[PDB]
Amino acid sequence: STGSATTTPIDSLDDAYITPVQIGTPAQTLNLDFDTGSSDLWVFSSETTASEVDGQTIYTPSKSTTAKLLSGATWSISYGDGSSSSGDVYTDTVSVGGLTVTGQAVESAKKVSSSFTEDSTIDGLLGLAFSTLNTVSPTQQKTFFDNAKASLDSPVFTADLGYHAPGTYNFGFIDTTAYTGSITYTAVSTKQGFWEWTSTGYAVGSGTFKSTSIDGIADTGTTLLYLPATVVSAYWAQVSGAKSSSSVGGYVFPCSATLPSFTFGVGSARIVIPGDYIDFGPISTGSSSCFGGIQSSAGIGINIFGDVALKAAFVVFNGATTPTLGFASK
Numbered sequence: 001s002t003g004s005a006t007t008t009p010i011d012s013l014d015d016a017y018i019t020p021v022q023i024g025t026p027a028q029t030l031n032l033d034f035d036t037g038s039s040d041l042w043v044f045s046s047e048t049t050a051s052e053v054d055g056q057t058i059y060t061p062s063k064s065t066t067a068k069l070l071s072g073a074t075w076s077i078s079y080g081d082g083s084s085s086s087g088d089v090y091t092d093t094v095s096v097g098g099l100t101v102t103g104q105a106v107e108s109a110k111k112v113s114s115s116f117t118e119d120s121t122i123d124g125l126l127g128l129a130f131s132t133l134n135t136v137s138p139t140q141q142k143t144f145f146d147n148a149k150a151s152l153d154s155p156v157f158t159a160d161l162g163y164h165a166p167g168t169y170n171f172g173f174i175d176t177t178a179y180t181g182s183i184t185y186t187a188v189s190t191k192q193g194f195w196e197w198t199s200t201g202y203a204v205g206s207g208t209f210k211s212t213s214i215d216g217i218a219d220t221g222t223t224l225l226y227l228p229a230t231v232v233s234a235y236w237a238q239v240s241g242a243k244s245s246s247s248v249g250g251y252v253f254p255c256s257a258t259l260p261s262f263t264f265g266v267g268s269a270r271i272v273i274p275g276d277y278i279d280f281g282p283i284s285t286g287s288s289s290c291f292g293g294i295q296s297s298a299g300i301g302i303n304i305f306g307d308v309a310l311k312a313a314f315v316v317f318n319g320a321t322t323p324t325l326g327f328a329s330k
């Protein structure tokens with residue numbers, strides 16, 4: 001089997017991407033944030049505290065003839081941005097882009113934190129990291145990808161995120177028309193439950209490439225590119241007036257600037273992030289200070305190749321027995 005679904009930015013800055021997902025019978029379509037940095041499929045639901053729902057589409061298990069309570073199971077998750085959600089669990093039929101999994105754990109939110117409530121465009125998350133991070137207790141559950149794997153033509157999914165445009169998530173096949181050149185594959189460590197890999201270095205603009213190992217995660221659920229303070233300082237030093245602002249929470253730059261590109265290494269290959277991808281616009285409406293798309297990972301504890309980096313590439317998440325990651329230009 002295979003699946004193919006379009007993913008769409010939620011706003012003009014590509015803050016996140018939503019992908020329609022069919023849950024239950026008859027189908028209830030919810031727009032989920034596909035997150036390669038977590039492993040829970042959770043949704044706003046008929047069980048969600050009413051005051052915490054504001055515009056989201058909800059899953060109502062009582063209206064699904066295939067929903068079954070997973071008796072005794074609960075879940076609770078906290079994300080890298082400080083947001084959180086929790087609730088109970090149903091199993092139901094879940095389809096993405098024509099690919100169907102039966103008996104998928106669908107985690108129904110009883111509570112969500114304010115940042116979820118305040119974003120009406122995201123109806124929940126679909127986790128695509130390794131199932132060892134799944135939070136369901138007392139019986140840990142599998143991700144949609146892990147459940148689908150055996151049915152897939154090839155045990156892979158691909159992320160092809162757009163810059164200020166829709167893109168695609170494919171399951172079970174590699175679309176050889178979706179990238180240029182060749183795909184360079186690189187080793188993955190699953191020890192922390194993430195798609196964790198080691199970049200071979202970086203360049204700023206037209207500068208020379210610095211060969212240096214940078215361990216990090218391929219994370220579709222993080223907006224920005226978070227790298228070591230040394231790397232990030234070298235980037236922003238090439239932008240007149242750029243500075244790190246503790247009041248704003250990272251590097252800002254004059255909105256009048258033209259940003260340099262940023263290149264990262266994948267083995268002997270190079271992925272170039274155009275400067276425009278690194279512009280996240282005014283810090284507040286009407287401000288001439290703009291927020292940068294490359295930020296320090298110091299204090300996070302891990303480097304994160306988020307959407308800013310991933311959208312510059314066609315990315316293969318290879319879930320074979322020994323997992324690997326592939327990157328191509330596009």
Ligand SMILES: CC(C)C[C@H](N)CO
Nearest residue numbers: 037038079080221222
């Ligand atoms: C591991 C985290 C820092 C990032 C994942 N997207 C979950 O928030």
